[PDB]
């Protein structure tokens, strides 16, 4: 499923970041970085879900997880 993050998608993210030229080894590196980030946030979000005795991860669970990792997100109920 990590391959679903295609080279064109990674290129678009780099373009928004102001990147003009990209090495061929960046795509695999980016996939690894994104996986680590997602794992960290999802782990905490699921912890909140289990504490609420819920079977559904809510947007609030994600917002709380981001907040505690110092990546506060505005627009999803906090």
């Amino acid at each position: 499923n990590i391959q679903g993050i295609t080279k064109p998608a990674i290129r678009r993210l780099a373009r928004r970041g102001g990147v003009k030229r990209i090495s061929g080894l960046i795509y695999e590196e980016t996939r690894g970085v994104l996986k680590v980030f997602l794992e960290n946030v999802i782990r905490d979000a699921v912890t909140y879900t289990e504490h609420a005795k819920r079977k559904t991860v809510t947007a609030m669970d994600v917002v709380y997880a981001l907040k505690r990792q110092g990546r506060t997100l505005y627009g999803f109920g906090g």
Binding site: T72, L73, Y74, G75, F76, G77, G78
Partner: protein, 93 residues
Amino acid sequence: SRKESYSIYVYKVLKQVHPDTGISSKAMGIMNSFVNDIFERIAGEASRLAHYNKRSTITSREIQTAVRLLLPGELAKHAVSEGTKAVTKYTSA
């Protein structure tokens, strides 16, 4: 199920600063998140100040000090003016 929000107050303030300007639901959600976030930051700092000074009451003095510690530069200067003016007007009803 009623879910309280600051939407009505954000709209009132918007109509004062920009009478002909509206706001999208997405932008309203950002504003609601912003107010809640700043509230938490100020109240949490005021709570710490009270505890550090062995006080059991959060007063306007604790809020003022929290504002000076959190808001940067002129944001703090003007926010303190607004808060002081409001308390003065309220005490004279």
